[PDB]
Design a protein around this ligand. Structure first.
Ligand SMILES: O=c1ccn([C@@H]2O[C@H](CO)[C@@H](OP(=O)(O)O)[C@H]2O)c(=O)[nH]1
Length: 190
C-alpha cells in the first residue's frame, strides 16, 4: 500500500438515508470512525489474506472504540470492527498488526477533530448549505492538507448531504498528504 484514507462519518446524515427501521446514529452528534483504508495507486485495497479478527488483541481499547468507533447503522460494534479489519485492515498487516491498526485509527480520530476545526469559523453543522471550497479550505488551514469530502444525494429531495470526511495519510500512517477525490459537488447540506 502507498497511503491510507482515514474516513470519519457524520452519524445523523448517514442515518437520514435509512428511511425505515432503527438507526443508532440518529442520536449521535460528533464525527465517528468509519474506517482506515489502505490505498494503492489511487484505489482501495480490500479483502487481503490475513489474520482473523481477534478481540483480545484490542481489549485495552474497548472503551475508546465503543465511543469513537460505534456501529451507527446497527447495535453491534464488535461486528463492525471485525468487518473493517477483514475487509481493510488485513491489507496493511504487513506493517501494522491488528493492535497497532486500531490504535492508529483511535489516535487519528483524537488528532483530527473536524467540528472543532470548523465551529469557530461559522462552518459547523446547522442543517444549512455549505460550500465545498470553504470546508476544504478551513480544514486545509487547520491541518495543513486538503481533506476529501464525500456526499450522498437524498432520493426524495435530490439534495446533497455531506456524510463523510476523509483525511489522507502517507504509508507511514502519520504524515498527512492531500486527498484528491471528492464525491461532493460545489454545495451540500451540513
Ligand atoms: O456505522 C457503520 C457504517 C458503515 N457500515 C457499513 O455497511 C455495511 C453493512 O453490511 C458494511 O459493509 P459494506 O461496504 O461492505 O457492504 C459496512 O461497510 C456499518 O456496518 N456501520
Amino acid at each position: 500500500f502507498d497511503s491510507f484514507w482515514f474516513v470519519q462519518q457524520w452519524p445523523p446524515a448517514v442515518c437520514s438515508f435509512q428511511k425505515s427501521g432503527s438507526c443508532p446514529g440518529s442520536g449521535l452528534r460528533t464525527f465517528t470512525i468509519h474506517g482506515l483504508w489502505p490505498q494503492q495507486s489511487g484505489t482501495s485495497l480490500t479483502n487481503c489474506p490475513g489474520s482473523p479478527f481477534d478481540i483480545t488483541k484490542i481489549s485495552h481499547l474497548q472503551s475508546q472504540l465503543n465511543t469513537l468507533w460505534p456501529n451507527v447503522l446497527r447495535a453491534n460494534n464488535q461486528q463492525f470492527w471485525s468487518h473493517e479489519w477483514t475487509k481493510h485492515g488485513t491489507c496493511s498487516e504487513s506493517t501494522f498488526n491488528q493492535a497497532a491498526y486500531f490504535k492508529l485509527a483511535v489516535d487519528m480520530r483524537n488528532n483530527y477533530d473536524i467540528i472543532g476545526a470548523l465551529r469557530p469559523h461559522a462552518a459547523g453543522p446547522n442543517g444549512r448549505t455549505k460550500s465545498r471550497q470553504a470546508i476544504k479550505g478551513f480544514l486545509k488551514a487547520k491541518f495543513g492538507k486538503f481533506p476529501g469530502l464525500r456526499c450522498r444525494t437524498d432520493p426524495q429531495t435530490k439534495v446533497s448531504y455531506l456524510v463523510q470526511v476523509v483525511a489522507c495519510f502517507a504509508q507511514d500512517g502519520s504524515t498527512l498528504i492531500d486527498c484528491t477525490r471528492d464525491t461532493c459537488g460545489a454545495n451540500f447540506i451540513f
